[PDB]
Amino acid sequence: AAALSVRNLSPYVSNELLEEAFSQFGPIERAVVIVDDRGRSTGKGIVEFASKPAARKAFERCSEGVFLLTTTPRPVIVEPLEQLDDEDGLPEKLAQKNPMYQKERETPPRFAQHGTFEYEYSQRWKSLDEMEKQQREQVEKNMKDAKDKLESEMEDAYHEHQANLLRQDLMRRQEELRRMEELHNQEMQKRKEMQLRQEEERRRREEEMMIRQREMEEQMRRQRE
Amino acid sequence: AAALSVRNLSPYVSNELLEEAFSQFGPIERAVVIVDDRGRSTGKGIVEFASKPAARKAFERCSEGVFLLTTTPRPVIVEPLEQLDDEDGLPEKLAQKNPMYQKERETPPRFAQHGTFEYEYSQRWKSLDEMEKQQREQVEKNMKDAKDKLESEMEDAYHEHQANLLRQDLMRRQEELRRMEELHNQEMQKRKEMQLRQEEERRRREEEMMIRQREMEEQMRRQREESY
User: Fold this and answer.
1) Rounded to an integer, what distance in angstroms lies between the CA atom of residue B123 and that of residue B135?
2) Which end of chain A, N or C, is less packed with Cβ atoms under 10 Å?
3) Domain encompassing residue A61
4) Smallest Cα–Cα separation from B48: which of A89, A133, A107?
């Protein structure tokens, strides 16, 4: 009653992932992945919500924004579920006999034979339907090939992003080291200068004390005479 | 699977009609016309047989030859039923078995916001998805028009048939009168043959009379001399 078709899932998307993913919009009554007879994923899914406003929010948000379910950036295409009945179908009782139904019953289920424009204009149609089928397949095949070429680019792009993140985190660490090394070079150069300087203050003081001793040795020798 | 997908059905084809039409191949387990919300016929349908060869028979007949069910010449296209699991699907337990399940389920379900590397690549993905819908809707539009340009042309051919059906009658009348002309020309040739015979019958009588008169006179002239 209140369900949506989910398209563009990834083979790794489970029913349990879908249940958990769409719970973000409202309560999930039932969530399933469409899978083939050999157990593999089709790429389609069904999300049955409890009420119509819950499914409305889910459809609207996924149309508006970009809803991702996995690590790989594959956007889930949410569309409303086309409800089609096979339980009751089209009974004869409620099939109105308009001038269009009565007239259509006037010929029984038959096989058209060659020559008659019915046959000739029957296969000629089949031919176009075969062109439609062939054209429909080519589109799907070209877009599958193109999305596969985009996942090959997204592959090389996400690596380059990570490689550049690290190449840049490496260069700040090379610079930090280069700066810590240089600061200490300067810090040791101030200590070198200081030592040589404090050495001369000691060297001069001793020379000054020796000279002033001979100055007081002269002043006393003079004061004798 | 012993069931088939029936398509290109008139909006008037019912479940009961579909059953009666396909019962000629084998036994019918179930025959249904797929209907939409509003209740209209979707043109599609399902036909289930009791045995696999009965379905094989029906598919083979309808793929080769042209099978119809209504007045309007709308052929039935039969394809083997594409069956996919809608109730069990792919559970976590079957999915966990794969190493990639834990790495994909590593980043939780989210809405990728502008600025992220994810958003750029998700827009480039939606861009190809929009390309697909536009290419697919284009393909359907073209064939809807071509299949309509064929249905118009069938109407053109239907009217030209009547134009040749009635023109055939005129050619037949021209041959009916040709025989009546021949019949009359024969019935006059008969009357001519008879006139010349009726005339000869009258003429012979005239001649036979003169011979009968001469013969009597010659006899009478003999009698008078023989008695003299």
Assistant:
1) 18
2) C
3) 1-86
4) A89
The pairing of beta strand A41-49 with beta strand A3-7: antiparallel
Name, in order, each residue with C-beta under 8 angstroms of B11's C-beta and a sequence gap of 6 or more. Answer: B40, B41, B43
In chain A, the residue whose alpha carbon lies closest to the alpha carbon of B73 is A118
Nearest-angstrom CA–CA distance, A193 and A8? 73
Question: Distance between CA A190 and CA A188 in Å, rounded?
Answer: 5
CATH assignment at residue B41: 3.30.70.330
Tell if the CB–CB gap between A139 and B153 is shorter than 8 Å.
no
For residue B96, the distance in angstroms to the closest alpha carbon of chain A comes to 9
Sign of the CA dihedral running A108, A111, A113, A119: positive
Reported resolution in A?
3.0
Q: Is B206 exposed, middle or buried (0-12, 13-18, 19+ CB in 10 A)?
A: exposed
B8 and A129 within 8 Å at the Cβ level: the answer is yes
User: In chain B, what residues touch A24 (CB-CB under 8 Å)?
Assistant: 109
Experimental method: X-ray
Among A170, A107, A205, which Cα is nearest to B17's? A107
Inter-chain residue contact A131 with B143, CB threshold 8 Å: yes
**CA dihedral angle for residue B165, residue B168, residue B170, residue B172, rounded to 10 degrees:** -130
